Antibody, heavy 222, light 207 residues
């Protein structure tokens, strides 16, 4: 059983956060509470609410006025709507499957979705500009060389990077972003490869910016 | 339901994360492990029980007002936030979480890689110097930039260090110039000081 939440993105103040969690490897009509929990940056876990396949809901009292959550058996998923949002609502939101309280074993949350970062802001979504970071003798260490991609000026987080569509994994190192005073983010991804085959192997970084529905594949040449 | 914000331990040494609340022993406690950038993972349920897949190194207890998650031969990869969760027949409550640190890890010097502006970025009328810093421990460095030997005191953005998957730290630093500024100096230097010693890398417009 696996849970997959819908993708990250921006929500305007007073707007409505709207997320779904697609359930696989099992059925929604199973005897479990399907739940939402959020985690503001640097904070703890905060329960939002839960539904049963029957339709019954339990909500955090402090949020109950703004929260609605529902199910959809035909698509095997459940969803969350949180209205009148403020900057306080900016958080990584998780979906989770919750065991019914059993008198012998108690309850538990398993499994969790991957988490989706929802950012509450007035600024516009902005996709990244990607620039190659070419390998050279100055980025070489004997038998290996470093090369990379600079992912500039995007908003909001997050950005994800793979190399050669995931066929290149060893030696990959994607660095956490800086926030520029402009309000935009930048990061870089570097991969270390054999220095002997720079003229032979093609290297392409696949830069994923889901908030803008953008993916850029940038060829990096020596 | 309270936990200590942080606890530290030596490698291979046992650490205890406590969770406390009134009549906690009358409740079933779960424990979750959440590594940075990751989802929480059920590590203990019903006070004592490990889900399939969780290694014996993790164990739990719960007596009186305190529940304890113990991990015996603590490795660097065990660093995480650990949350307890207490169950009634009517409710659950999450603990505030405890960050675990492992301290006496072997010292490691930073690898520094510095890239000049791509020709593509220059034709977009910008110039970013990219200084990437890897494989250092402990996770603290100081970054200074020079242009022809003089300190650059503006236009620099440097991240805080973050853990790599091999348990050493990484950081990055960016110097943002105009193409004009880039071409108007002979040399630029990114200098990374770690534990009193320094690694410098140079780029030059004339290639």
């Amino acid at each position: 059983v696996q849970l997959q939440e819908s993708g990250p993105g921006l929500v305007k103040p007073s707007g409505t956060v709207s997320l779904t969690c697609a359930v696989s490897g099992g059925s929604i009509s199973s005897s479990y509470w399907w739940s939402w929990v959020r985690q503001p940056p640097g904070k703890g876990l905060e329960w939002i609410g839960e539904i049963y396949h029957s339709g019954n809901t339990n909500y955090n009292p402090s949020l109950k006025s703004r929260v609605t959550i529902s199910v959809d058996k035909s698509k095997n998923l459940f969803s969350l709507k949180l209205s009148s949002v403020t900057a306080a609502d900016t958080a990584v939101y998780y979906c989770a499957r919750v065991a019914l309280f059993d008198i012998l074993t108690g309850g538990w949350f398993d499994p969790w979705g991957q988490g989706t970062l929802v950012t509450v802001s007035s600024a516009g979504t902005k996709g990244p500009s990607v620039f190659p970071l070419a390998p050279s003798s100055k980025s070489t260490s004997g038998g290996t060389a470093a090369l990379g991609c600079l992912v500039k000026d995007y908003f909001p987080e997050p950005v994800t990077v793979s190399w050669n569509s995931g066929a290149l994994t060893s030696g990959v190192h994607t660095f956490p972003a800086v926030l520029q005073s402009s309000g935009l983010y930048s990061l870089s991804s570097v991969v270390t490869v054999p220095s002997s085959s720079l003229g032979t192997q093609t290297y392409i970084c696949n830069v994923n910016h889901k908030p803008s529905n953008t993916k850029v594949d940038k060829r990096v040449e020596p | 339901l309270t936990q200590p914000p942080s606890v530290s331990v030596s490698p291979g040494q046992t650490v205890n994360i406590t969770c406390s609340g009134d009549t906690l022993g009358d409740k079933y406690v779960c424990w979750y492990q959440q590594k940075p950038g990751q989802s929480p993972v059920l590590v203990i349920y019903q006070d004592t029980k490990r889900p399939s897949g969780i290694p014996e190194r993790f164990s739990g207890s719960n007596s009186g007002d305190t529940a304890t998650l113990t991990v015996s031969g603590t490795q660097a990869m065990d660093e995480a936030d650990y949350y307890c969760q207490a169950w009634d027949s009517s409710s659950f409550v999450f603990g505030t979480g405890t960050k675990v640190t492992v301290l006496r890890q072997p010292k490691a010097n930073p690898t520094v890689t510095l890239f000049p502006p791509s020709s593509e970025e220059l034709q977009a009328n910008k110039a970013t110097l990219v200084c990437l810093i890897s494989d250092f421990y402990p996770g603290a460095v100081t970054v200074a930039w020079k242009a022809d030997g003089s300190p650059v005191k503006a236009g620099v953005e440097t991240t805080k260090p973050s853990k790599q998957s091999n348990n050493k730290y990484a950081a990055s630093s960016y110097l943002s110039l105009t193409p004009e500024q880039w071409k108007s100096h002979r040399s630029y230097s990114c200098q990374v000081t770690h534990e009193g010693s320094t690694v410098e890398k140079t780029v030059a417009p004339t290639e």
